[model samples]
Target chain A: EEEDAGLVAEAEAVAAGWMLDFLCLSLCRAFRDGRSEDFRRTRNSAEAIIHGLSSLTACQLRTIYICQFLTRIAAGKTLDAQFENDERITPLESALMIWGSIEKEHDKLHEEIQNLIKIQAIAVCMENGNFKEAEEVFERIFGMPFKSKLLMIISQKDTFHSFFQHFSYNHMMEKIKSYVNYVLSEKSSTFLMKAAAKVVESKR
Target chain B: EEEDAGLVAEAEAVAAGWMLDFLCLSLCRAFRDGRSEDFRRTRNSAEAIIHGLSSLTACQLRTIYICQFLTRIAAGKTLDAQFENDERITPLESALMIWGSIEKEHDKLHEEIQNLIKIQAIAVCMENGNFKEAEEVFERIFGMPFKSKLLMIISQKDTFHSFFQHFSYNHMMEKIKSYVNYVLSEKSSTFLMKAAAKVVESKR
Candidate 1:
């Protein structure tokens, strides 16, 4: 049965309203109160609520995933462990899924979702030493604010040397070389270019 | 000035209660309502409240940081960019700072704080290609459950080659070689050992 547009909108709005309330008020409060039993129980309840709400809209699911992510961080769990079974998925996958659902909508959340998905996808490639893919994803980051762009560059740069691998060493070197040249030629911040050059020279 | 214990307890408890309620009721509500003005305005209000509450204890500070981290995430900001100025600090640094403030307390939250700190520290090193430091921090991850340890190892492994560089290539290769051997000799799961070996071979 097709739901009415008005009904759908109201359903999504109220569900999101209650979900966020439940997370912040119920789960986070339990965490702060140091009530382990309450926290665990409430978290499980939240999970159950989201799971049963199978027809929730994309935005609602996005909100749910973000809420789950925050709770996991508070619980000291790794983001990769967000899923329990083969049927479950990682947070990165969740973000990608949401982005796919919303990308063409061009709605209010579209740009934000697009930016987030690109950032996450780029990080995944950078982490895997797949600079080729990272470069591809990085291009999709066009039109983001300057500070965001600069911050992404710095964070991605920090990510570059952290997961050291010898076999794919030249891949990263190429990335640095290209980025440094791009920075210099684009007439971007001189300090940034100098830092990139220093990193390049250090590796050499 | 020394605070009265009863007064401190009441203030912290009620403040926490009110803070959690405010977060769930106010900011999260604004977010879901798609009211950008309200969301930004409420977030700023929350920041002001937390900032003005300077004498909050470590646990309170922990809760505040966790709340701030979640809000930043929801705002589409990078974790590393949580701080805006020289006086501010990254989320990782913030976690460490909180850990230091509570490590010796051995309070109810002590174990949780210790685990979170170690995980973040290990991640920082793994991201920086500092396997030596990662290893050092990894040792402190004692007494955690088996699943958490396994999860940490797997996540850190993902962090390993994501930031590829040639200069420290040998360092990561050494780590892979060591871990593969360790997994094999520990008589752990055959599947795990085989997987680790595959990664090792690929790197080689």
Candidate 2:
């Protein structure tokens, strides 16, 4: 039993690491390539990281560190001179707009900031290969970020990778398997998959 | 015509002043009562202020001044005694987390800082009577600070109160009339009423 547990843990760790790497690479590549739209593609990886980090009993510090790192990466910045042009808004301008808007609406600023940090953590766990843990993070985020229906929509639609494209698909799919397992542990994944499929079909 | 223009300008100034007062009073009251939530609430107001200011032609200096004021508000502080047992986290911690996370991901810190500033600006406008402008800001924030439909829903819903509470009823009515004339000139108020009725019907 102990050996089995250790093997499972090792597998989880590998999955989390891969997820985090995928997120980081995807986000960085999006920035480097001037692919502004693809930046959103990193969501699944971030979600995986959060799931993994939250499950560790004594690894809170590691989770916190990873979260902090992801937040920094998500912060908008200016594109290099090579990427600045009429076809797209520079990252610098984007960053400025966010900063300005938050400063003006001080009331919910902290809540929004916290959400950003949490999302960042999700990214880190994925990088570390903790697939099941990363899924848990996404579930938590989906639960609290807003309402349940929207969360369901997000989970089903698999919209995480729509914003960025550089993430490793192999790593992401492994994490996805871990996510399926985590969800199935509590409830039937078959039901969720069916529901998600229905929603996707309607949208199409 | 000159007199009308002067009156309009004065009215705008008065509205702006009242909005600032509301923000200060709310913030100060929150601090005085040891309501930590007040900190976040005040920050939201600050964000709206920055947003509105940025839309104006002459805003750089004003923005700088507001930023300095807000930074002081967010400076080192202790937790409220009342909140000691609360599971909810404080705004300061939340903000630090976001800042730290962003720093880890990007080498260019300045660009991120600017983006935050811009977001603050949008917050200001939302607090003032500029929902449309705030919408633009939200679209910009899609992937960076907020990457989900969950965020989108909140952004849309939160605007109503920010606009109504800050703007005087009379001025708001005037603006509404103008908006109706320009954007929905062919549509009657009766049709608007029907739409509103349909909303009630759906809720039922």
Candidate 3:
């Protein structure tokens, strides 16, 4: 309790000066599964994490948390044009909208950020003709066997754009590395070929 | 030398925004006796420390480094009044003018920053008192003794002014506490305990 009290005082003094670095440390720790919820968002508490960080500005939470996962792959994303943030959507209202998604298997990222990190990864893997790696990441994110997923990522003009839209080459590498490390470190990897293992199970 | 290089880079970054906190860290370490000498005027090496820290702003070097220590302890301070900055000064060129006092007692706070830190500590001790810590600090700085030095911190009103013109009650306590730590920690407490033994050689 005393340490907690001291932490709050120190936070009060330090936060006003170093919020940027602080935010990075918090969000990245989540990515690594190294985090303990600061409140409701303990290590695996994704829902609580989202709401907890809502008050921040330009945070990893701001870009990645407000996702809309599709229960079924929205194949052909022949879908529609989107201007999601334009609506008078809100805090409590948005939380409820997202609550069900949280209870289920997966969640999606905010549109702009989604296009940026995920589709970009698939595209990079496609460019390198590496489908298995793309398949795994896609499966984790979309929860579908995969859409026309890679089946037709090729023909659509916007698909290519979506791939590169928000992703940079280095950004793609970060995702690939995260994926590779995950697969190698998963406890069930005992059956995989020794050559398939990853060098890092945990991020430093 | 590489250490000096690293220090300059770190100081450049830390001083601009965190200089106030930076000052506190340094003075405390001195308060901890983790300091040596830059020279005789180490306590008065106002000039060396100034140049040393002209590189940094608003630090231990921030206050004294910037202010020109009038070689004299500007006695009685009787010259009417003092109008610190914003206006102008003619009388005595503004104590704020010679505002910086560079004296001699042993210059040193480098050579392991024997030129920076040790010299830095004295200026602060001198800025606040006459000397005992200075002697002890200098002894550590130059391999000499004379806690007997801080022994004589009285006499001239100017000296008193030197001790208090800029000193405040809290500041005196900080210096006194710092002094007690230095004397007792030297393990030669028996030499000086014709007086009070330390209430705290270590922080509570």
Predictions in order: chain A TM-score = 0.32, 0.29, 0.27
- How well is each residue in B1-204 modelled by candidate 3, as lDDT tens digits? 676334423422332223223222223333344243311122332232233233544334434522232121221122233434533222223332332242312222212212223333344444456355444544544442323333354222123344333434344334434433443343322211111112222212
Residue A180 miss distance in model 1 (angstroms): 35
* Residue range B85-185, candidate 2, lDDT tens digits: 34333323333333433312244443444344334434444555556655654555442433353246336756444433443333322432332232222
| Candidate 1 lDDT, B1-204, residue by residue in tens | 244333333333343334333333344434334456655655654554453244666645544654454354343223345544543343444444444553243554445434444455455556766566455545544324833653565455656543233224334324323322432243323222233334444544
Taking the true A–B contacts (Cα pairs closer than 8 Å), what share appears in each candidate? Answer: 0.00, 0.00, 0.00
Supply DockQ values for each candidate.
0.01, 0.01, 0.01
Clashing residue pairs found in predicted model 1: A127-B162, A160-B163, A162-B127, A162-B128, A162-B129, A163-B160
Could you tell me how far off, in angstroms, the CA of residue B31 lies in candidate 2 after the best superposition? 1.4
Residue A139's C-alpha lDDT in candidate 1? Answer: 49
Candidate 3 chain B, poorest ten consecutive residues by summed lDDT: B190-199
Error of 3 at A4 (Å): 16
The CAPRI class of candidate 1 is incorrect
TM-score of 1: 0.23
- How many residue pairs clash (N, CA or C atoms closer than 3 angstroms) in each of the candidate models, in the order given? 6, 104, 36
Query: What TM-score does the A-chain of candidate 3 achieve?
Result: 0.27
